[PDB]
Design an enzyme around this catalytic site. Structure first.
Site, short mmCIF file in Angstrom:
data_model
loop_
_atom_site.label_atom_id
_atom_site.label_comp_id
_atom_site.label_asym_id
_atom_site.label_seq_id
_atom_site.Cartn_x
_atom_site.Cartn_y
_atom_site.Cartn_z
N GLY A 1 73.04 59.96 -10.81
CA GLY A 1 72.29 59.82 -12.06
C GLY A 1 73.18 59.61 -13.30
N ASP B 1 65.37 65.34 -15.01
CA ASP B 1 65.63 66.24 -13.90
C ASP B 1 64.77 67.50 -13.98
OD1 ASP B 1 68.14 66.26 -11.69
OD2 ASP B 1 67.28 68.22 -12.10
N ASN C 1 62.00 65.88 0.87
CA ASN C 1 62.13 64.62 0.13
C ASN C 1 60.82 63.83 0.02
OD1 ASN C 1 64.75 65.43 -0.35
ND2 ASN C 1 65.74 63.77 0.82
N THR D 1 67.12 57.70 -2.99
CA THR D 1 66.93 58.90 -2.18
C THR D 1 66.91 58.64 -0.69
OG1 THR D 1 65.59 59.92 -3.91
CG2 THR D 1 65.35 60.81 -1.71
N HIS E 1 71.62 51.65 6.52
CA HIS E 1 72.94 52.24 6.74
C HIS E 1 73.17 52.63 8.21
CE1 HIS E 1 73.35 52.41 2.48
NE2 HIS E 1 72.68 53.53 2.28
N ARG F 1 71.20 66.77 3.57
CA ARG F 1 71.03 67.36 4.93
C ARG F 1 71.91 68.63 5.12
#
Ligand SMILES: NC(=O)c1ccc[n+]([C@@H]2O[C@H](COP(=O)([O-])OP(=O)(O)OC[C@H]3O[C@@H](n4cnc5c(N)ncnc54)[C@H](O)[C@@H]3O)[C@@H](O)[C@H]2O)c1
Ligand SMILES: NC(=O)c1ccc[n+]([C@@H]2O[C@H](COP(=O)([O-])OP(=O)(O)OC[C@H]3O[C@@H](n4cnc5c(N)ncnc54)[C@H](O)[C@@H]3O)[C@@H](O)[C@H]2O)c1
Ligand SMILES: NC(=O)c1ccc[n+]([C@@H]2O[C@H](COP(=O)([O-])OP(=O)(O)OC[C@H]3O[C@@H](n4cnc5c(N)ncnc54)[C@H](O)[C@@H]3O)[C@@H](O)[C@H]2O)c1
Ligand SMILES: NC(=O)c1ccc[n+]([C@@H]2O[C@H](COP(=O)([O-])OP(=O)(O)OC[C@H]3O[C@@H](n4cnc5c(N)ncnc54)[C@H](O)[C@@H]3O)[C@@H](O)[C@H]2O)c1
Lengths: 318, 313, 313, 313
Positions: free
Chosen positions: A14, A33, A95, A119, A175, A82
């Site tokens: 951020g 936030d 999440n 995220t 990924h 995680r």
């Protein structure tokens, strides 16, 4: 009037997005936030840096969604890691809930935003985020490819000792094991990697190891930092996506986008090459994959569907 | 031969310095720290970000001072956050860092950020043995940045058109000169007469500058400012690397100016390829001179204390 | 959608304007002119340069006003380089450009560079009928740029650290204020007292700024300056486009300030998304006031000469 | 110290080089020309622009080669727009330019832009006697830029996502390789299959690239392209100065690669702090080889004419 950029999450990524958005004069920034103080503090810190470099931008820290009202771009990094051997279903549960809160925020206050999700796990979270928010899908994307592409390009530039600017890579999917690189559509100055291998620039075994390093690139940084994950290259990557939107650049970027037929995928988010302009995802580029490439792509798309179904399990709302 | 920048300290400031040095193409970067993994991880993360914007720089993460060999600029943020306990802890850090630079980067321009600034940079040049004109402390640019930002808000003008003039250190030891601070060259007291703001408000803005660092700490809770401090030191490094000759408020060794000798104080300096090339000696009035003197005496005390921990100084 | 910038006139200044808009990514660019080929030529050339640095911008050359439609900014360099022959020719050009702007880009921020500047911008807002706070002339920034450059050479400091303050127009109509010009906030008279320069040298620098345009004409022989003027207008454009609120010396319509009404004069302004948002009205001393009035009277004369030529005004 | 860039020729290209070099903070600039006033005037005009954007660089106009002493990069645009008459005039210029570089800048990286390029650069390195890896011709970058711009328009994508691969020189001597030119890594021939465009349109873009320079001359009527040629040479200089190791198409001396010895040809080179650090030798198919050999033959032809007019070579 200036563009307005909201950053939903004021952690290390951020803050880096805010700093890059100031340095590059992309517009005013809101750092949002749940934590009190963090967004105010960083925002003020960055704002106080501004006279040194000479950019004029407002930086507002907020703990309320109303602060994001009318944002032209929203960049979502809010969520949990995680930590450290917690369940895979535990993670998705936390999440997905965050994606629901953020999605309500954007729908209410910034309905016309271009939304960039960061995220994790990305392909699922960005898919949950557009469903929960109800924004048009061509206005909601996930950042994953640009980052993998940046790592891969960096490693190749080291291997070949040429500018990072002259390395091009072509990656699809997400990924790790979900990444689907096309070495044959990856180049130095337009010379495809297979031809560079033929010429002796590197070996096939070395190219494979570089591809693997790219798959594991996120985990490498975790292994060096120990207490957190990568933030510089992830921030730079998302800012490039935002910039293409803000400046109507029509860059061709690998991004998690909603497929509706292409590559034979429907109603799902998959890493594909996209043209990003002032109207969000303006084209999704459909290449003709070969049999091995198609296999790996279909495997990757299937793995993402599996994750999405796990999310529908935990949150049947979807 | 690219320029080489060594960052001693790979905390939040150190990392931000590295990112800026990358983005502004200032040269190759070495991140040093005693902590294994951190410099290496930040360096690689920054390097991996480079294809996005297309700057070509090497980022090396290191735990050995030999890695800084030949560095053109060294920026020191190493240190820890009882007055004589923190001094003794940080003096020992300056001692190591000084030894490192002396051995591997003797020709470097050195910019110190470790608190307490005026004492630390003073100790660092003694320990390193480097010529004083090549060892400076960053403080003024940061205070000056905060003050300009606050005035920019108050008057609703560009940060680029506000100039402020500061001497001394942070907090109570800062000596601002309103009459030498301006918007487009019009001094603050003239702006106040014109109704741009009130004296009471100007006084609060000066106070806010004094407390500016503590303000960010109170908002972050777990750490301190790093964007503005990083930007401020990069500006000083850049003026050196590009021989720009900017007039920056910097902790420099005085040798007679303002009636001070063998001591580092926040003064106006011209920074170029030779380091501190010039110190500007302005004519202070009675009250300014009194404020400056009180400030120098307070820096004198910290130095006396340091001598009384490391008699080597 | 991107910002659109329309350049009325595609000579050396217009081309430089287009190149700067491109490099700085201020938006799409329209080059307009009568000369066939020229604007389409320079536009294509700049466009073909774009892949090198990687900026994405459209460069459209046009010989017809319709191309400027919806421009966010319009910059007018059109015109020709006896006094009542110059006023007559350029007045006629201001009329054609004004109707073009009125018809196609009525919401534009307009920046006039056509000489004689203070009279032509005044004529241009009358012909166009655009709101005055949206039509300004470029002159002060150019004078100020030269003045700052000469001072940077004199003191051997960065151009970034020199501030100058100028009212009025070019040449003998300039009214510089030494007391509001500084190096890092130290006014020029105080720099003279420290021995950084002498008053004689300052006076020559001031005279050199008055003659700065003729100097370049005398070196070039077959044309006039275009890099500094172009850069000067782009700074103005940019403050508008990015809503920076820079404080810039600009020809602006006064309506009471300084004792002047229905007239354009070089004053400090704040330029933001609404164009001229504030005209800053400083407290002139007796001599400054006298110099300002002489300069204003001189501009009044030019405008009167124009009303005699074009009673429309 | 700062880097020093000497521009031999102060026409439209030379001025643009000087502007770009200033804007991009590449160093101090010397503008050389035989014409009095021109370089002095452009140098001063650009320097006077520097306070607006804030770059700190010296600009010196000179009419004597001694002004270029110590130059790190020299960019040659000197020259003149019967074929054996042109070669005779411009070879004279390369002799004079060669003599000045040899005497005053023997360690410079020399970038030649004077036409006809592959002959003139070849001649220039013989006259100057500088190491061949430090003397190059700018041609391929400009063709590559135009080609990438045309494709970017064709497919409606960023110029940053098009790559083109070109060997040889301009016009008929250009040897593009469609298979090594891409959008986002997708080769031109595959884009045809995917129906993004047709082969006929590609062929027209290629032809347009061959005629790009003549296209600009036709639009401008009374001069040739200067923005894109200047951007292209700056990119080459910048890769040297910042040791980037960009892979650029440049006129370089071959000594065996592709079957060519002791001649300058357009090839892919890696440009870094030592100049041409590598020449990339790709695997040409038989039709590409024949195209390339035809192009090389036509360059050998020109060099022989040059030897005819100047046996010295
Ligand atoms: N997709 C990629 O390519 C990529 C790469 C690296 C990291 N990431 C991901 O980015 C995310 C965050 O990155 P980071 O380094 O800033 O981590 P971080 O934990 O420092 O940032 C998370 C922030 O979100 C806030 N937050 C938590 N719950 C919230 C809620 N309900 N609403 C609003 N804010 C909330 C936290 O207070 C914290 O500030 C992680 O999920 C990580 O896996 C993604
Ligand atoms: N002068 C100013 O204006 C100013 C402003 C803000 C902060 N600071 C100061 O800057 C310093 C660093 O700030 P930060 O926010 O980066 O804190 P930080 O703790 O994040 O950074 C310090 C780093 O130095 C390392 N370190 C400690 N001892 C070391 C040693 N002997 N050798 C090498 N590394 C060592 C630590 O492992 C840590 O990574 C502090 O002293 C802080 O007070 C100064
Ligand atoms: N105000 C200042 O501070 C300042 C400083 C320097 C120069 N200037 C002025 O800048 C102006 C232009 O400089 P330049 O380098 O562009 O010179 P230039 O001659 O290259 O540009 C003038 C252009 O205007 C065009 N033109 C002529 N009549 C026209 C018309 N009726 N409509 C549209 N276009 C027309 C011409 O074809 C030409 O291309 C001059 O008027 C000069 O006096 C002003
Ligand atoms: N190779 C390429 O890729 C390429 C592309 C475009 C243009 N060009 C060539 O570049 C050259 C420069 O173009 P331009 O726009 O600057 O032209 P220009 O005529 O504006 O510039 C030429 C300058 O060189 C000067 N000159 C002439 N003889 C000289 C000498 N002996 N020594 C020093 N200076 C001398 C002239 O006074 C003039 O100022 C032209 O010859 C053109 O053909 C090459």
């Amino acid at each position: 009037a200036r563009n307005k950029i909201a950053l939903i999450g004021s952690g290390m990524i951020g803050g880096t997005l805010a700093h890059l958005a100031g340095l590059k004069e992309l517009g005013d920034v809101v750092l949002f936030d749940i934590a009190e103080g963090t967004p105010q503090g960083k925002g003020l810190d960055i704002a106080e840096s501004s006279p040194v470099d000479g950019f004029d931008a407002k930086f507002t820290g907020a703990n309320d969604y109303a602060a994001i009202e009318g944002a032209d771009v929203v960049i979502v990094t809010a969520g949990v890691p995680r930590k450290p051997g917690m369940s895979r279903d535990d993670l998705l549960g936390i999440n997905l809930k965050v994606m629901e809160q953020v999605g309500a925020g954007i729908k209410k206050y910034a309905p016309e935003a271009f939304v960039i999700c960061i995220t994790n796990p990305l392909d699922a979270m960005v898919w949950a985020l557009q469903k929960f928010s109800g924004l048009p899908a061509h206005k909601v994307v996930g950042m994953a490819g640009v980052l993998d592409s940046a790592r891969f390009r960096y490693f190749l530039s080291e291997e070949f000792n040429v500018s990072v600017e002259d390395v091009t890579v072509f990656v699809l999917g997400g990924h790790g094991d979900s990444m689907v690189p096309l070495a044959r559509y990856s180049t130095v100055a337009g010379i495809p990697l297979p031809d560079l291998v033929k010429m002796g620039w590197t070996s096939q075994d070395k190219l494979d190891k570089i591809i693997q390093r790219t798959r594991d690139g996120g985990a490498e940084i975790v292994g060096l930092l120990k207490t957190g994950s990568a933030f510089y290259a992830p921030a730079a990557s998302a800012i490039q996506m935002a910039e293409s939107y803000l400046k109507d650049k029509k860059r061709v970027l690998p991004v998690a986008a909603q497929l509706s037929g292409q590559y034979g995928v429907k109603d799902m988010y998959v890493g594909v090459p996209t043209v990003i302009g002032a109207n969000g995802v303006e084209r999704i580029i459909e290449i003709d994959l070969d049999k091995d490439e198609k296999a790996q792509f279909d495997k990757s798309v299937a793995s993402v569907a599996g994750l999405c179904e796990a999310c529908i399990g935990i949150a049947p709302s979807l």
